[PDB]
Scaffold this motif. Structure first.
Motif, PDB file in Angstrom:
ATOM      1  N   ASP A 271       0.828  -1.195   0.000  1.00  0.00           N
ATOM      2  CA  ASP A 271       0.000   0.000   0.000  1.00  0.00           C
ATOM      3  C   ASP A 271       0.866   1.250   0.000  1.00  0.00           C
ATOM      4  OD1 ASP A 271      -2.637   1.606   0.762  1.00  0.00           O
ATOM      5  OD2 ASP A 271      -1.090   2.177   2.203  1.00  0.00           O
ATOM      6  N   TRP A 272       0.431   2.263  -0.744  1.00  0.00           N
ATOM      7  CA  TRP A 272       1.078   3.563  -0.702  1.00  0.00           C
ATOM      8  C   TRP A 272       0.106   4.701  -0.454  1.00  0.00           C
ATOM      9  CZ3 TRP A 272       1.252   1.059  -5.655  1.00  0.00           C
ATOM     10  CH2 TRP A 272       0.323   1.563  -6.571  1.00  0.00           C
ATOM     11  N   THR A 273      -1.192   4.416  -0.350  1.00  0.00           N
ATOM     12  CA  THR A 273      -2.161   5.473  -0.102  1.00  0.00           C
ATOM     13  C   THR A 273      -1.886   6.169   1.222  1.00  0.00           C
ATOM     14  OG1 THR A 273      -3.835   4.253   1.129  1.00  0.00           O
ATOM     15  CG2 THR A 273      -3.685   3.874  -1.236  1.00  0.00           C
ATOM     16  N   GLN A 274      -1.627   5.400   2.268  1.00  0.00           N
ATOM     17  CA  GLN A 274      -1.128   5.992   3.495  1.00  0.00           C
ATOM     18  C   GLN A 274       0.297   6.491   3.269  1.00  0.00           C
ATOM     19  OE1 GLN A 274      -3.240   6.549   5.872  1.00  0.00           O
ATOM     20  NE2 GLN A 274      -3.978   4.689   6.884  1.00  0.00           N
TER      21      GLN A 274
ATOM     22  N   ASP B 236       0.779  13.805   0.394  1.00  0.00           N
ATOM     23  CA  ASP B 236      -0.554  13.342   0.047  1.00  0.00           C
ATOM     24  C   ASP B 236      -0.824  13.449  -1.444  1.00  0.00           C
ATOM     25  OD1 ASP B 236      -0.419  13.423   2.750  1.00  0.00           O
ATOM     26  OD2 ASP B 236      -2.303  14.505   3.063  1.00  0.00           O
TER      27      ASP B 236
ATOM     28  N   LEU C   5      -0.025  11.413  -3.929  1.00  0.00           N
ATOM     29  CA  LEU C   5      -0.572  10.163  -4.442  1.00  0.00           C
ATOM     30  C   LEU C   5      -2.022   9.987  -4.015  1.00  0.00           C
ATOM     31  CD1 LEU C   5       1.066   8.255  -6.231  1.00  0.00           C
ATOM     32  CD2 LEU C   5       2.518   9.732  -4.844  1.00  0.00           C
ATOM     33  N   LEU C   6      -2.329  10.311  -2.759  1.00  0.00           N
ATOM     34  CA  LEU C   6      -3.690  10.157  -2.263  1.00  0.00           C
ATOM     35  C   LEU C   6      -4.667  11.022  -3.050  1.00  0.00           C
ATOM     36  CD1 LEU C   6      -5.511   8.891  -0.116  1.00  0.00           C
ATOM     37  CD2 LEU C   6      -5.121  10.923   1.273  1.00  0.00           C
TER      38      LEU C   6
ATOM     39  N   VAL D 275      -5.052   9.862  -6.739  1.00  0.00           N
ATOM     40  CA  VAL D 275      -5.869   8.673  -6.945  1.00  0.00           C
ATOM     41  C   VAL D 275      -7.329   8.975  -6.641  1.00  0.00           C
ATOM     42  CG1 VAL D 275      -5.477   7.711  -4.642  1.00  0.00           C
ATOM     43  CG2 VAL D 275      -6.065   6.201  -6.536  1.00  0.00           C
ATOM     44  N   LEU D 276      -7.608   9.864  -5.684  1.00  0.00           N
ATOM     45  CA  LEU D 276      -8.999  10.234  -5.435  1.00  0.00           C
ATOM     46  C   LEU D 276      -9.611  10.944  -6.638  1.00  0.00           C
ATOM     47  CD1 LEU D 276      -8.361   9.443  -2.450  1.00  0.00           C
ATOM     48  CD2 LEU D 276      -9.873  11.316  -1.815  1.00  0.00           C
TER      49      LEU D 276
END
Lengths: 96, 48
Positions: free
Chosen positions: A5-8, A59, A61-62, A65-66
């Motif tokens: 995981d990379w979202t966190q 953030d 990447l977060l 992706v959102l």
């Protein structure tokens, strides 16, 4: 197979892939974990990682992706999917 | 020759040794860091 995981936000490289070498009890001995590098067949060289100094505490990447997930159709989703796919690939590839 | 001050309360290994990869512009090329490890001569054994 597991998934990294990379979202966190990532504090550092994951343990399984950055740990220097393992120690197996079957031989009660140390040996180098393959997850660092592997010899590419009949090429005379081996691979090499190169972390980038802006892979951590972001953030980006977060939110990317959102805003890719927000979409509705499929063809539009595909392009942002590919973009973020190659994103961290290029980030971690480095000068190598 | 330099020296490593371990009397300092350490947080991680110094970057001079732990990382096994550095990119030099002499040949604009990457190369593994030799400080990572060196094999023992004529025995096929690599330190860790």
């Amino acid at each position: 197979v597991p998934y990294w995981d990379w979202t966190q936000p990532i504090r550092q490289l994951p343990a399984l892939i950055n740990e220097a070498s393992y120690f197996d009890s079957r031989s009660q001995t140390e040996e180098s974990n393959p997850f660092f590098q592997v010899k590419i067949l009949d090429t005379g060289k081996v691979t090499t990682r190169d972390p980038q100094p802006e892979l951590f505490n972001s953030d980006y990447l977060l939110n990317n992706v959102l805003l890719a997930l927000e979409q509705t159709s499929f063809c539009d989703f595909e392009i942002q999917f590919e973009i973020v796919h190659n994103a961290l690939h290029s980030l971690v590839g480095g000068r190598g």
